[model samples]
Target: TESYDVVVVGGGPVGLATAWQVAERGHRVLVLERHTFFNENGGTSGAERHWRLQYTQEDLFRLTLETLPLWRALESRCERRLIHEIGSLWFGDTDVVTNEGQISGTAAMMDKLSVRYEWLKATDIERRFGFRGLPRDYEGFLQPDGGTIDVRGTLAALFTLAQAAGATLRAGETVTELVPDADGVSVTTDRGTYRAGKVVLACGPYTNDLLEPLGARLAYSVYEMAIAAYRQATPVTEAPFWFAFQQPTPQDTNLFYGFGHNPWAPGEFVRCGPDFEVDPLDHPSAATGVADRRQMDRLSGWLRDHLPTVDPDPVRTSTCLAVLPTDPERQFFLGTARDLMTHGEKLVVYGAGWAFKFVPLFGRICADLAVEDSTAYDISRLAPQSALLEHHH
Candidate 1:
């Protein structure tokens, strides 16, 4: 009951996907979660996350391309549609570097990668999305296959598949300590102790708890991003999630974004908000679900001033905690435990950056590192080993 081939910590999308991935590979896998599955305690915030192939880094751009097929494979197995592949739109101060990538830079990367995209002016955006006043100097572009992920649905699919594959998943069982020896790793949770041939740590922001005892931790900052839904004037039943890359102003970051009403869930309403960077906490547990009122106010003001698609007032408000690397590029990492697992050889870690898009892909990557001690995936540029035990941020 307490031993397995692999044990995974954190039951977010990545952890759950790892559960299924490892289990399918004919290994006994046990997953531990501090909170209930699909809870907002981690990065997964709302119904969707924007899925785009646009990135300034050629490596990640190709990685995104590589990940698409895996997503298709998952869809076929789950027998349910997960990606809302309508389209995606990027507009605003194209030169600005945010956590994801500069919009204009993505265009260049897409060009080099042979992906198709169409350019648009501010006027074009105004006509299509029902927007008002805007600077003529601003421009935008659209990618037909740039998609939106149904986060909730994706999580469900993985959870169901993991269960079907016979992985033991326990929620509310926080992993407190990990003692890795030459034989296997000891996993001490608040509830019980288990041992596994290898342990995969995907504990998001809470990863520090186990790592601290070994003399290191993943360096990152946590932010409480405020998100809300607005009533659309006319029901949106189509493609293209929109994001403004406007230069961050003193009052606002101006990184406002929104998605259209999906056919699978909700109608005549668009969820919109800014990636407000007001308070940066050292940990995710420090978050108070009560987000900054100024964010909602800023979002409301932007809606009222610009887009005519929605009622300016938010019908509902919520907060999702985000773990972000302070590094300018905002890269996520997956790596070995280096010297921390001195007596043992298998402790892999992953998290940081905006990783929802790579959910299932990371599952396989983590499993490969844990089981086979190597991965076929090209993570050379991702800097697997150096990313851990050293401060990349």
Candidate 2:
């Protein structure tokens, strides 16, 4: 029914952000969200998520480092305390590597990048954060800047900022198909059809719903990840965001992470959960969005031994769909659609991985690719060709 300079499908953090960046650059941009902005049913639904500059790969660490200033920029624009810099503690087996990457390797990279961190031992953790019974040999470090980001607040801020920047944000419009032509991309939704010079597919689990039929496929598994919040033994008992790389148990497919109680939050509780996927579904549309009971139990069992100041039993539980690339290495699938699709157009497709921390940065990058067809940031390792992705004609 209409056209624009850029059409961003999926109004998640990245999509809305792209809309802001593109519109601010003086382009007509339309952002489509299948549901209301910040809806509880979206992939990024939650009040808080950990923000860390930790990564096993040097490039990713650098990328996160680059994002810090951008977060500040957003904070300045929104005039809100979007990030709570309470610091973070990462401990457990130094030698083990989970999907999140090697704990020690991340530390080494931190040192390489000159991000200040203090090394710690098991006893130190117990003395500082009230953890109990960690393995004697476990080593860890504390990064002062690591903390929590206000997820809902950030989304709301982005929504308003994008709107103020002259972006058309339309919710309840689900994009059903993409027709790329010599001029631009024609996007068809359940309600209407629109065209644009470039299309940014920022949809999370539902991404392939449009890409696959175009003979371009990026394999990813959609999991309904569970989050359980437990009551703190003491409301004022202080703690920081933390993570542990455990000795791979048969039941633990993912790392366990937790956030300290946010003062603004209603209940004085600590949020924690494992990254365990509730099995892969054919698509995110098939996800139950129900918290998996067994995963919540695993969380309680781990909390029982580790966090002495927090009750192991969860008081509340929630769920959201997580789209993890089928790549064994957990590489994010980013970059131009032409790089991996036969029907590729002037489209920038972004998806997968732990992206909340990099939301603002990814938004700028998606805009760079969509508007200029290039970016100064190093996405060399994150690009489709870097993953040696398969392209079908």
Candidate 3:
């Protein structure tokens, strides 16, 4: 069997980041991915994703702070601007927090970090951003550091950097089983078998299936995240990347976010969507590629009601997999597995939907755990053995 110091299952953003770090640390690393790295099947495959420091979770905010330098460093090495740096705008009830109670938490953390931000009134939002329609009660906040990351470019750069660092990234190799023992773990794939001193399971939606056979299952649910692009003559070019947490119903208790037109795409249009979760098990193959018609209709209605300047109907819509931790806190899982806790034989790191922004730092943490059995950051809350999983068991 081919052997390496570390074998990462999944070549998505987190996996590539982890492999790059581990390889940079002078260890042989191999990354096995089921699909092409740029395949739409993974969450990290896209033109852009939000990069913001506004987070209710202290750990996540702090991780973002720690990751900024690394992000810039990557940009310098890659010789391009990965972050657009146009800033981000948040609009909602001031009393409303994020799903994880981070509504005011982000501003609070920003205060602690000394990150610059400005609170805007409804009039100010309309005047400054040229948004014609906004509720009088809706509040606004702008974080200068927040912007959009070039998803495809960044991932491609990370893959190149990891390969340059001597890590082997093999796509189209689906890991079917992971057998952990006292010394290391045996990774079985459809194409071949490999041994590693430790394994980092970063498989997104397919994580549970890979772990269930090993008797270590993380309570995770796969959801379909849909993003829709609307064709418009005057796209919201002046508006920053925006998110609104309003008009909540029992069925959709989440934020709706959107951004300006894509510079690379052909048409002048805006992309927006509500962050809704659907039961993946109910769909074929644990997920569906088609956007839910009902959800899309609701989203269109929201656009028409809120932002009247843009067309409600979308010209294009796409779907991606969002593997979330089935916990009330929605915290990530970023520690050793329960079965191999004593020997540190296996390490598993997972995120709901917010992990893309924290890729560099999360990768560093995973590398620390895999190479040295520890990390400087306190990730206790994100440990696999959380109250949710424990109570469920």
Candidate 4:
């Protein structure tokens, strides 16, 4: 039997982040992950490999932007290459009202929030970047701070830091059962039983499964997030990450995004291939969804038709799980599963809507809640039980 002050389940982004914090806070920590360290496509999180730090929400977006500096610091601290700061550009047709919502929404939100954004009309883009294959009446916004990161590298760095900070990190391990009590909690794994004063469940898509015994419900459905990659003879040195607003006459959700393969990444044309549906229960294989092929076709077709800016041919593709909510209202609960943690003093459950960018921040908050019982930031609305249960009037 092993013991630690706190135990973190799942070694995805959120788990790694929590491990780093709890360990740095001078508590003994343990991280249990089910997979080895070499998997690249875990959690569909490689999207960080090409980041577009653009958001309509002010404080949240600012919080995300502020994280870049921490990444810079992490790079130095861990002596690893993590984030690549390539600015991102969004393109959409205004005459067709394609990108109008995103552009206008972005402008309005940024102005209201006092964040930095440069709105570019068609002419401004033509003069500056020289339109290759942009549609007529196209408008855009340039987020200079937006860029990509090596997500796998970042995870490695975080795990390294946590281990250095005295976190007893373990891979190829899964926490099978969680028993929490006031005195403490016992985390049973395939390997052995470990007791801890607290536990942080950053289990990602499998979270509900972990908490189901306690009536923990998830209002979200797991999605297949697909990214397409195109072949490029020469590296896209001058290319910017782009999101396209497509014709919405038939389709309701008419938007797509892609980025240039980093010069650092292997392959001549690196890109997100396509998104397809799959169960988070099924990874690696889920990435190979049958529908994914169709998505790839669509992605390539879009690049060919609209992105005169990018090479049209695809070389390779990647996919990940995007856990989105079923309720029309998109929100997440970030607090303790007190109803579920029957015997536990602090079994902080940090859950949120599919906010991949905030995984690290969420982990930090969960750690704080476990240790300090609250966070400096007020995250009251994101409580887990709100939407799951019906309130009687």
Q: Cα RMSD for candidate 1? A: 2.7
What is candidate 1's lDDT per residue for 79-107, written digit by digit as tens?
A: 98898776788888889988646887888
Model 1 residue 212 CA deviation in Å: 0.4
Query: Where in model 4 is the C-alpha error above 4 Å?
Result: 45-54, 65-69, 94-101, 122-131, 235-237, 249-254, 261-267, 273-291, 308-311, 328-332, 339-345, 385-387, 390-393
lDDT by residue for model 2 (1-393), tens: 798999999999999999999999999999999988888786786688887766656666677779989999999999987888778888888878676667788887877877799899999988888888888998898887877889988998899999999999999999999988778999999999998999999988777778777766676667777888788885444477888887776766647888865745775677898966356777677777678788888888988988868888888898877776777665577788886664474778886766788899999999999899899998877764323355354
Residue-by-residue lDDT tens digits, candidate 4, 156-219: 7777787888888788897888878776778898899999888898776677766767555655
Steric collisions counted per model: 0, 1, 2, 19
In angstroms, the error of model 2 at 366 is 1.4
lDDT at 282, model 3: 42
Q: State the lDDT at 181 in candidate 3.
A: 79
Instruction: Output the number of the lDDT-best candidate.
Output: 2
Each candidate's lDDT (Cα)?
Answer: 0.80, 0.82, 0.75, 0.65
**Candidate ordering by TM-score (highest first):** 1, 2, 3, 4
Candidate with top TM-score is 1
For candidate 3, what is the lDDT?
Answer: 0.75
Task: Give the poorly placed runs of model 1, Cα more than 4 Å off.
Answer: 237-239, 339-341, 384-393
Question: How does candidate 3 fare on TM-score?
Answer: 0.87
